[PDB]
Ligand binder design. Structure first.
Ligand SMILES: CCCCCCP(=O)(O)Oc1ccc2ccccc2c1
Ligand SMILES: [Zn+2]
Ligand SMILES: [Zn+2]
Ligand SMILES: [Zn+2]
Ligand SMILES: [Zn+2]
Ligand SMILES: [Zn+2]
Ligand SMILES: [Zn+2]
Lengths: 326, 327
């Protein structure tokens, strides 16, 4: 069974899953301290519920919200939105790229215990347990990021819960992360190397897939094309089209890797961790939001000749195998 | 009136005040996400209540908790401990040295609104309103720190609440905070230059006091050494003696500046933003906690011949003048 913000669900109940999404990109405590940054908590809930309900109408049954403590994960927000939209949400533990001092001063043993608290006991006082561990690196893994990766591996070996990563920007960091994970004895089948659609290097992707890693092509809608005059947009969403991103799904299917592929939008309903009103720029590129994958990518891949069955395998079977604890 | 975590109090209720303290040094959301770091929330509350009751029995009536959002301020913790200890606590807005992205991406105008929300409306959902604005800088003030200082000046000018600031990693640089604050039209009498006991340069402190700034000699018990192993202990407390620090209080008095002096401990009852078990290092060097000022420093100054009336001016009158909102 998989833990969600509404409690445990069976695999059969998971259904069509977007495995890399967020309700709100933020910082720890920030939504509680300054909800009016989002116009109000109530407005952000309403936006999230309308968006998830549109995704649900397009067939989405589950999302995995990969926001960690330091991305401002608010598990009560997740719970409210999950229940109102009636879509399963899996919450996350782990450490993203903006740890505060109380996180970044911690040893590997301490970080392991924090992730275990979140998976085993619950998040804060809520009893809501994490279903995935999210980690991130920049460039070359920093000493602190290596501690986070080792703690993630150890928490996953203890609980069976999977790890999702990424490397900041379009740097291809999977091989360095995979080295660390394997040094801890973590099976590749527990690890998704995320934001892998940021690169065209198919040799890099195929080799990771061939080792049994899951490949997150999780950014598909993010494109700054047409937004060339917005330098903040280009830095966040890149210059590659969504079709270019989507064709990596095809390329990996064609190389025999369909079982290793996880697809998502990396969308959200509010963001405070970047420039002000960035959500508006995002919303203007992808008015579909989280429904982008079912509504637009899926038919795109069918049209390129991929079998509905192979698409169902990527969007249903792969996420269930990935999320079910081992 | 002055806002506290229990509501508004009158000037005459403020009493002997420690103007630079913390209940817990932490990070935003951390005490809620990992209270077992502190052994438990229940354990942190008990320790804080005992420590504030000790300070109270030593004559303390009010503390100012200068912890900002990014220092992990939990106003519900402050309200709980203030009630159980019967010591008023004034809470803070502002930005310390660990702003997360959602803060460090903000403009001066946005930060001004955030500080105004916490002063005028309340902190989080609690209705508890900040009574001071805390800001911090390093080195040569960074561009982001300059934004924070100007937003603080604008929030103070709109509400009358004062500003407490310091320069981390050096023993001067109040001159940087002063130039920026004055460029915004802020009166120096609304500003305390904190951690001023870290320097031995008295001409520097006297020149700020002559301009009307208040001088925080607020780190007095952090002098302590004897721990020559720890890079941690020294890189944070340092190598001087507390007496030498306390003598800066007498030095400013002798220069005619008694009205400009605020004294405190910069203590806390939990700390997660540095090395694990740093709290135990701090408690071993200063087992008096927040009672160190009234139990050690005040009698030391008395024995150096400072009169009662002067010591009451520093500990009672100056903090009430500082904290009372004055536009
Ligand atoms: C800066 C705050 C955004 C919060 C979203 C967290 P994310 O890391 O999963 O989203 C991003 C945000 C920007 C990215 C830029 C290049 C490559 C991948 C990127 C992923
Ligand atoms: Zn990411
Ligand atoms: Zn992502
Ligand atoms: Zn993401
Ligand atoms: Zn300080
Ligand atoms: Zn201080
Ligand atoms: Zn302090």
């Amino acid at each position: 069974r998989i833990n969600t913000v509404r409690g445990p669900i069976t695999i059969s109940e998971v259904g069509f899953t977007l495995t890399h999404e967020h309700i709100c990109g933020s910082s720890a405590g920030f939504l509680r301290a300054w909800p009016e940054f989002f116009g109000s908590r109530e407005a952000l809930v309403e936006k999230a519920v309308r968006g998830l309900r549109r995704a649900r109408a397009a067939g989405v049954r589950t999302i995995v919200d990969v926001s960690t403590f330091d991305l401002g994960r608010d598990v009560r927000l997740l719970a409210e939105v999950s229940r109102a939209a009636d879509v399963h949400i899996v919450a996350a533990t782990g450490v993203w790229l903006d740890p505060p001092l109380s996180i970044r001063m911690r040893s590997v043993e301490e970080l392991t215990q924090f992730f275990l608290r979140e998976i085993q006991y619950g998040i804060e006082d809520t009893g809501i347990r994490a279903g995935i561990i999210k980690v991130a690196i920049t460039g070359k893994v920093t000493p602190f990021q290596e501690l986070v990766l080792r703690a993630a591996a150890r928490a996953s070996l203890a609980t069976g819960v999977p790890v999702i990563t990424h490397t900041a920007g379009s740097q291809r960091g999977g091989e360095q992360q995979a080295a660390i994970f394997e040094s801890e004895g973590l099976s590749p089948s527990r690890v998704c190397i995320g934001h892998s659609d940021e690169t065209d290097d198919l040799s890099y992707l195929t080799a990771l897939a061939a080792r049994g890693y899951l490949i997150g092509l999780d950014r598909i809608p993010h494109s700054a094309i047409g937004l060339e005059d917005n330098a903040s947009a280009t830095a966040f969403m890149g210059s590659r089209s969504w079709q270019t991103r989507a064709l990596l799904i095809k390329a990996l299917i064609d190389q025999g890797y369909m079982k290793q592929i996880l697809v998502s939008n990396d969308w959200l309903f509010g963001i405070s961790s970047y420039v002000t009103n960035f959500m508006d720029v995002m919303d203007s590129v992808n008015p579909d939001g989280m429904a982008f994958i079912p509504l637009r990518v899926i038919p795109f891949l069918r049209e390129k000749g991929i079998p509905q069955e192979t698409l169902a395998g990527i969007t249903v079977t792969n996420p269930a195998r990935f999320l079910s604890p081992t």
